[PDB]
Each structure stands twice: as C-alpha cells, then as structure tokens.
Amino acid sequence: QVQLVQSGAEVKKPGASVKVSCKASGYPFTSYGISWVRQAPGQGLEWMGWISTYNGNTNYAQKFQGRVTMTTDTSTTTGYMELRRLRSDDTAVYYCARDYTRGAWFGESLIGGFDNWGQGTLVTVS
Amino acid sequence: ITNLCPFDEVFNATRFASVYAWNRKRISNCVADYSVLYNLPFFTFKCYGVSPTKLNDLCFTNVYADSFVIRGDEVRQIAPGQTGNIADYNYKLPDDFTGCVIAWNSNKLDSKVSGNYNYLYRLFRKSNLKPFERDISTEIYQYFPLRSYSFRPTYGVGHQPYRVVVLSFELLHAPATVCGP
Amino acid sequence: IVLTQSPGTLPGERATLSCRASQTVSSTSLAWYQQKPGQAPRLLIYGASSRATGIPDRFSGSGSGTDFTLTISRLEPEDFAVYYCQQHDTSLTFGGGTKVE
Ligand SMILES: *[C@@H]1O[C@H](CO[C@@H]2O[C@@H](C)[C@@H](O)[C@@H](O)[C@@H]2O)[C@@H](O[C@@H]2O[C@H](CO)[C@@H](O[C@@H]3O[C@H](CO)[C@@H](O)[C@H](O)[C@@H]3O)[C@H](O)[C@H]2NC(C)=O)[C@H](O)[C@H]1NC(C)=O
C-alpha cells in the first residue's frame, strides 16, 4: 500500500526556482531511496538524480549537476527537490519515485527498478 | 531503534566480490528482521551456535556480512573446522565461529557463454590464513597466485557459481546495536 | 550508455519490442516500464526477466549482451501504451520510448 503524493502545478518566470515535494507512506522511509525523473511534453523520461533517505548522499545527472538540489526529511517522511534558474525548456512534469536501483546504506547497485511513482508535478515556465 | 537492517542491500546486490578479495559490510543500529531470509532460493542456510528460528528474538553488539562468489563444490568449505583451497587460502572461519552461512545458485546471473573471468581465487600462498584474514597481494609465489574461475552456463552444478553471505554475530559485554523485532 | 528502441510505432496478437544498447548491459541492471496516457510510468520487468509485483503473466522480458526485448503474448485493450527500456549499469539511462498502437 505504498503511495507517493506530490505538490500541485506551479507557474514560474525565467530565472526563478521551483521546489517540488513528494510525501511518502506505506513503507519504512529510510529503507529506500528517492529518485526524480522528468518528462517534457512529447518527450521521453529523463533522469535528474537520486538521494538516500538514510545518509543524505546524492547522485545527480550531469545535465542538472549545477542546477538541482535534493534533500530529505525523515521526520515527515517527505522528499524535496529544487531546480534553479528555470528556462522555457524546463517545462515538464516532474515525477518522484521509490528507488530500489541503488542502496541507501551502502550506495551499491541493486537488482530492481522504480516501482512506485507519484502523480507528477507540472511546472510551467513562461 | 526505528531503522531496519539493510539485508536487502546485501543479498539483492547486482555484484558480489571475488573470494580472494571478500567484501565485508557492517550492520549496526537497526532492527534485524530475518523472516525474509527464511522466506526466500536460499537453499543453503546453516547456523552455528544459534538457531535460525530464534534469531528473531536476539540482540547483538554487531553483525557482519561477508560476501563472495565460489563454486558449488566449494560451498562445503565455508564452515568451522573445514580445510581446502578456499578455507585455507581465501576465506577462513574460526573453529568457534558463531553465525549463519547463506548460499544460493547464481548461475543465471554470473555465468557467461564466453566465460566469466571476473571472479578470482587464490591458489598459491606460503602459509594458511587466520580467521577472517584477507590477502589480496599479487606477489609471485616461489606462479601468479591468483587464477580465474571462468564460469559458464554449460557447467554441471558443482562448477556453477554460488553467492555466499556469511552473517557473523558478535556478542560482547556491551550495549546492543542490533535487535530483532 | 545509449539505448535505442524500435519500431517507432508497432488486440489478441503477439507484440515484441526491442531495445539495443551501444554498450554491454548486465542482466541485473536492465528494466522495462509501461506508461499509459495521462499516467505515470510503472515497472514491468526488472533484472531483464523477473516480473514486478502486480504485473500479469502475459508480460515477459529477456536478453543479454546489448540486445534485450519485451514480449506480450497477446495484446489486451489496456496494453496499448508507450514502453521504455532502462539501464543502470553505468549511471542511469532511459531509452527513447516505443509506442504500441
Ligand atoms: C529481493 O527482491 C525481491 C523483489 O522485491 C520486489 O521487486 C523489486 C524490484 C522492488 O520493486 C521491491 O520493492 C519489491 O518488493 C524480494 O521479493 C519480495 O519479497 C517480499 C517479502 O517476502 C514479498 O512480499 C510478500 O509477498 C507474499 C505473496 O507472495 C505476501 O503474502 C506477503 O504478505 C508479502 O507481501 C514480495 O512479494 C516478493 N516479490 C516478488 C516479486 O516475489 C526478495 O525478498 C528480496 N530479497 C531479499 C533478501 O530481500
């Protein structure tokens, strides 16, 4: 009965930042990581990065290495992502997912995938 | 303690270490749920000094998971009181070892048609290992000390790869860090 | 690692979808996803073969080296969706996506 609940749609101006939340329930928060993937209209799935809910370690995609910051809060079992200096090309739906592709405690690769996904948060830049 | 012990991240790993260079992962400050290990493929499950059905009620000061890959016929060497080229030159357990040995057939993942040469074992050394000793040197033996397994899907069971995880249970006159539920 | 899928666009008939990597991808590091219109992607196959919990038996994946596939033995009205291949042997990548129609 795992669920991921994301914030609603946001509208931002060029140069602005957006922070998108993802509330998790139905499982031990510190046993699984959090991944973020975005999908622009008409496009496929693009990986943004990963964070461990246990030790705060991160692994970012090169494309967002200097733009995206990911954090977690284990007291409210909620993940957060902030994307800086938004451009018109960043209009997309941003999804959170439960990560079982990398361990949260050891950082090693696991045999798995992204099983639970949130509904997605639409971010528009104009 | 609210955190659960990361057994999942030890047993469901994509990659295991070579037996000549076995890898140790430390488990601490967590709740040890052993039901999954009983629940699963894990055909080999032998506990020494402790019952596999009582682990749910015990507390430990530390738990250590030693992971490595060996041949099916070498699985019998991962035990106290045993000898052989794994027991003596790659991975030695103490005669008073306390813990559980879990192993399963990984032929589907580790074996390759061209041969998997990534896994190595030590054949030559001037002396036998001490309990939980590791030797990863490549100094020439008075022969090159390491030799590949060359695992293949066409091999009989005794020559197929097995993934072995040894769970060592440390009990000291000290506050526990790992407890079952 | 770059993942190329084909065909661009593909009830009761058998469907096969392909994903070829520019580099060798381990069985342990490859997965398949399904995305219905208006919905988030879901995991179908992991480890290149094993089914995710809740996935019907008609869905099965396999492969090795650089060539992996996903097979649906008979298409249902609900199986018409965009499928993706994923690898995390190196970093983490998604394929272009293949549409079943
Ligand atoms: C190694 O990983 C497998 C698979 O885990 C599953 O697939 C991954 C890709 C991720 O999506 C995981 O989040 C997901 O759980 C583990 O197998 C799973 O084990 C659990 C616990 O035993 C099973 O849950 C039970 O299922 C039975 C019904 O068969 C119920 O009656 C129980 O109440 C409970 O829900 C789960 O079904 C099972 N998954 C599959 C596909 O069989 C495996 O345990 C794990 N190995 C270790 C050592 O952790």
Numbering used by the authors:
A (entry chain A): 1 to 126
B (entry chain I): 332 to 371, 373 to 474, 489 to 527
C (entry chain B): 2 to 11, 15 to 105
What does the study report here?
The SARS-CoV-2 Omicron variant of concern evades antibody-mediated immunity that comes from vaccination or infection with earlier variants due to accumulation of numerous spike mutations. The Omicron spike (S) glycoprotein, which promotes viral entry into cells, harbors 37 residue mutations in the predominant haplotype relative to Wuhan-Hu-1 S, as compared to approximately 10 substitutions in both SARS-CoV-2 Alpha and Delta VOC. The Omicron receptor-binding domain (RBD) and the N-terminal domain (NTD) contain 15 and 11 mutations, respectively, which lead to severe dampening of plasma neutralizing activity in previously infected or vaccinated individuals. To understand the Omicron antigenic shift, we determined cryo-electron microscopy and X-ray crystal structures of the spike protein and the receptor-binding domain bound to the broadly neutralizing sarbecovirus monoclonal antibody (mAb) S309 (the parent mAb of sotrovimab) and to the human ACE2 receptor.
The SARS-CoV-2 Omicron G339D and N440K mutations are within or nearby antigenic site IV, which is recognized by the S309 mAb. The lysine side chain introduced by the N440K substitution points away from the S309 epitope and does not affect binding. The S309 mAb, which is the parent of sotrovimab, neutralizes Omicron with 2-3-fold reduced potency compared to Wuhan-Hu-1 or Washington-1, while the 7 other clinical mAbs or mAb cocktails experience reduction of neutralizing activity of 1-2 orders of magnitude or greater. R346K does not affect S309 whether in isolation or in the context of the full constellation of Omicron mutations illustrating that mAbs targeting antigenic site IV can be differently affected by Omicron. Whereas C135 was identified from a SARS-CoV-2 convalescent donor, S309 was isolated from a subject who recovered from a SARS-CoV infection in 2003 (12); the latter strategy increased the likelihood of finding mAbs recognizing epitopes that are mutationally constrained throughout sarbecovirus evolution.
